[PDB]
Amino acid sequence: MLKAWHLPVAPFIKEQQERLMITLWLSGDDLPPRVTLRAENEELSLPMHRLRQAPHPGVVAWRGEINLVNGQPRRRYSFKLLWADRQLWFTPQEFNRFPPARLEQFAVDLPDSGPQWVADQVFYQIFPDRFARSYGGDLDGISEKLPYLKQLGVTALYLNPVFVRRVDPQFGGDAALLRLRHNTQKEGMRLILDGSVVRHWLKAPWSMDGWRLHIAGITQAAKLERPDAFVFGEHFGDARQWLQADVEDSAMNYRGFTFPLWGFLANTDISYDPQKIDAQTCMAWMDNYRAGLSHQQQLRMFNQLDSHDTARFKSLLGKDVARLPLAVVWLFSWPGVPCIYYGDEVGVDGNNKPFPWDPALQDGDLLDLYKRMSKLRKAHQALRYGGCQVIYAEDNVVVFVRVYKQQRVLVAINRGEACEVVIEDSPLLDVNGWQLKEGAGALHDGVLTLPAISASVWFSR
Amino acid sequence: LKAWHLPVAPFIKEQQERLMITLWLSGDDLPPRVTLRAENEELSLPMHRLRQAPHPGVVAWRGEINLVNGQPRRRYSFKLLWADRQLWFTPQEFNRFPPARLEQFAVDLPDSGPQWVADQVFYQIFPDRFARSYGGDLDGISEKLPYLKQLGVTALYLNPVFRRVDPQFGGDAALLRLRHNTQKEGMRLILDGSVVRHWLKAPWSMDGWRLHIAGITQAAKLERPDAFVFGEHFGDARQWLQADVEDSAMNYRGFTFPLWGFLANTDISYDPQKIDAQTCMAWMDNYRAGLSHQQQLRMFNQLDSHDTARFKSLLGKDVARLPLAVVWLFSWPGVPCIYYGDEVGVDGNKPFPWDPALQDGDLLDLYKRMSKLRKAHQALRYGGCQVIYAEDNVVVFVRVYKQQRVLVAINRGEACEVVIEDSPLLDVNGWQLKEGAGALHDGVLTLPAISASVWFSR
């Protein structure tokens, strides 16, 4: 059986001066005697050579390189495996018998001009009226509750709504936003507002970090005033045409994250229509969306379980509310920036409720899980810059591994009865050993033993 | 469970400001509800079920899109609903998870594109090697216009031309004589490229251009609204076409190279390909799915042009498949472009043989025959397209327009027999064989070696 591995990330890619080194792993009994690196606005057949040293037992590696001196910054490429009588393509979505779409190839953004600080963030979306009064909640309440959020792991705020260009008088007006700006700066937290005007709130003294919004005229203006500005869109549907044209840095990833989990974990969708979706279909869905985005784009994607236009995810789970911790691990370990909707971390429910500041009205076991996943992401670069490969997706069980240099982060998710899962030997899983850091699952000799309705995270040492 | 829909009548109808959409379903556990998922706001439109079966064993669902609001490209899909699960029906059959927005059915209502392109047969000319009035010129093309009309050509594509017309071809004046003469013969003219507008206005009044790129198209359409602007793309042209900066593309990814691989075991890199009918049809249908029906009718289909080897040569020892590709060029959605000399057997990697003893007359008649068939049958020009059958050596698809059906069977290998699953798209009074020597008898499709046959519904 032919096998292949590649992710748009080290150990698979390295920049040496103006050359992008690209490496493919192969395995099987009838290996292609040649492989061409197929890259780009002219398409090029770049020859690859086979390396002497096996990177892992039973694997042969091929290497080619792209010249970065010419060409647009988004470097798209795929692999064309060559036999004497036939060819096979290797792509973000496994093998292809016929050439993949230009926008479904691997891509890395070199140079990356996107907002590089986003991948290092943990976001918190606030409905100002319902969060904290200094119902009547306002921006000074948020300012007062900054220690709470810092204790939670928040590093960036998204305010929706803000304006009535004037801040709503009910929230404290312009002057309270100037305090919140000063106060987040002193707390090292980014601040993003929901919306000439784009440039006005990005300049001093407002100096906001970005906006929630052809339409590229807005993004170009925002980047002119502030080069590391974050411009992302609200899309309940397929945002890829906008993202594939760089008019937005990112999108609230409903199609690529939220609705798959709604289907796999909560049997529903945005129309509250029923979904009977298994693990294999959910990862086909999630891996298919991702493929239209570069690795850098994937890391800036806005992942959430709910926002202000949706019911609370805790409510949608209904009788299956025990699966909620599965979604919290997943929110922090799937590529992209996590966005917590205010109150999710303490157990707020409801459909489409003021924040309970009284600790007896909070779910503390859930709040601790958020703190644990927060510390895990901040402490491990693979959770923030790593590539992502789905290792296993059958029925109730999802297993994927984040990959960055030597680091491996294994995530195993089980929505149903306790079970044992046979993990095929994988050169991506060839580590010294594994340290269990979240959940209570067992990895012993190729087997993953998973409690019912559980999610567990292992880290490579 | 089975399902059928094509972005064309009888499945689509415009009634004033509402587009009626009809879905056919068949099977033993049919969905109790179906919602039409339509289009920059996504809408869940309710569909109601029709009382009368349009074909035996088929139940129909109908909904409507309000055309008063919204962009002209009407994209939609079907969301089948049970009590416990859902399933999507798309241009690429059923899907378990939502299709991409650019993987939907789409119709252009109103169509602002050049509606005349679908009614054409194009002919690409390298002026130096075609006709002297090696010394070929535009006055040669004018003198050979009767020959081209006899072939069925209705539009010419000149490459190269030039910014000024090359003096070796007769200069600006020989092109103006070519422009006037093609107009009197009812023929369109496309030049290969403010320059955009001066050649589309009088006295040049060319019918279009071959090629940010939106500015060029915008200028072409401002001077001439039915201007045809298409790009030469060897790769995935979909991002340009899905953004309306081009009217069309030389369909290398969606037609030529699938056919190079399935028929000639090669590709643009002259790398080997082992592509079967399943993979070839999966490939061609996948590309199409990113384009509206109107766009698909404008796609520039070719077997080769000036940057490629001759398809007759690429077939090498399998040159007997050549008439298979000529039938296919004229019946797959899109406009055929004949590369000058293909119709008389020119090969190479090439002066035109005007001596009839240096011409292949049997191949030339096939070109004439297919031209008359396409020009005389609307389904070959405006019809939707459904793959009926695709395994190993045999491709079977049907063009669908209102009540008309055009059935096309292609066999790359040995004589063989094929069982065609009953399809409500093939529920006709009868079929009349108009091209080739195939046979259709009670679910059996008998196909000669290395053949392609075309049937028409009566």
Q: Read out DSSP for B255-314? A: IIHHHHHHHHSB-TT--B----HHHHHHHHHHHHTTS-HHHHHH-EE-S--TTS--HHHH
**Looking at the partner chain, which of A45, A274, A284 has a beta carbon nearest the beta carbon of B97?**
A284
| Cα-based torsion angle of the residue sequence B313, B318, B324, B328 in order, rounded to the nearest 10 degrees | -60
Residue B87 pairs in a beta bridge with: B80
Question: How far, in Å, are A139, A204, B141, B359 from residue A173 at the CA level?
Answer: 9, 17, 75, 84
d(CA A433, nearest CA chain B) in Å: 36
Q: Is A174 exposed, middle or buried (0-12, 13-18, 19+ CB in 10 A)?
A: middle
Whether the bond between B203 and the residue before it is cis, its omega within 30 degrees of 0, is yes
The position carrying tokens 């891996």 is: A287
Tokens of B287: 């590309």
CB count within 10 Å of CB A275 equals 20
Residue B456's H or E segment, with its range, is strand B451-457
Any B CB within 8 A of A366 CB: no
CA distance A247 to A368: 37
Cβ atoms of A362 and A327 closer than 8 Å = no
> Resolution of this entry in Å?
2.7
Contact A97 B275 (CB under 8 A): yes
Contacts of A450 (CB under 8 A, 6+ apart): A397, A412, A414, A418, A419, A420, A421, A441, A442, A456
CA distance B103 to A156: 35
| Cα-based torsion angle of the residue sequence B145, B151, B152, B155 in order, rounded to the nearest 10 degrees | -40
Residue A449 pairs in a beta bridge with: A420, A442
Residue A14 pairs in a beta bridge with: A21
Cβ atoms of B141 and B178 closer than 8 Å = yes
Cβ atoms of A157 and A190 closer than 8 Å = yes
Cβ atoms of A216 and A247 closer than 8 Å = yes
CA distance A459 to A431: 10
CA distance A302 to A256: 10
**Looking at the partner chain, which of B101, B236, B275 has a beta carbon nearest the beta carbon of A237?**
B101
Phi, psi values for residue A153, rounded to 5°: 105, 5
Any B CB within 8 A of A214 CB: no
Tokens of B407: 């059935």
CB count within 10 Å of CB A365 equals 9
User: B57's torsion region: left (phi>0), alpha (psi -120 to 50) or beta?
Assistant: left
β-pairing, B444-447 vs B394-401, is unpaired
CA-based nearest residue to A306, from A314, A298, A296: A314
d(CA A292, nearest CA chain B) in Å: 11
Nearest CA in chain A to B280: A98
Nearest CA in chain A to B86: A275
CA-based nearest residue to B37, from B99, B111, B107, B84: B99
Cβ atoms of A233 and A242 closer than 8 Å = yes
Tokens of A299: 């890391």
Q: What angle (nearest 5°) sits at the alpha carbon of residue B378, between those of residues B374 and B383? A: 100
DSSP state of A205: T
**Looking at the partner chain, which of A87, A263, A275 has a beta carbon nearest the beta carbon of B272?**
A87
Q: Label each residue of B81-147 as H, E or C.
A: ECCCCEEEEECCEEECCCCCHHHCEEEECCCCCCCCHHHCCEEEECHHHCCCCCCCCHHHHHHCHHH
Is residue B16 helix, strand or coil? coil
CA distance A107 to B405: 43
Contact B101 A236 (CB under 8 A): no
Cβ atoms of A55 and A66 closer than 8 Å = no
Whether the bond between A227 and the residue before it is cis, its omega within 30 degrees of 0, is no
Cβ atoms of B445 and B419 closer than 8 Å = yes
CB count within 10 Å of CB A426 equals 16
Contacts of B426 (CB under 8 A, 6+ apart): B388, B398, B405, B407, B420
Any A CB within 8 A of B102 CB: yes
Q: Is B228 exposed, middle or buried (0-12, 13-18, 19+ CB in 10 A)?
A: buried
Residue A379's H or E segment, with its range, is helix A364-379
**Looking at the partner chain, which of A45, A80, A241 has a beta carbon nearest the beta carbon of B102?**
A241
Cβ atoms of B196 and B220 closer than 8 Å = yes
The position carrying tokens 């509206």 is: B292
Query: Using N-to-C axis directions, what is the helix angle for B322-331 and B257-264, rounded to 10°?
Result: 150
d(CA A282, nearest CA chain B) in Å: 8
Is residue B341 helix, strand or coil? coil
Phi, psi values for residue B309, rounded to 5°: -65, 165
Cβ atoms of A138 and A168 closer than 8 Å = no
| Domains defined for chain B, CATH in brackets | 2-106 (2.60.40.10), 117-376 (3.20.20.80), 384-457 (2.60.40.1180)
The position carrying tokens 């192969």 is: A26
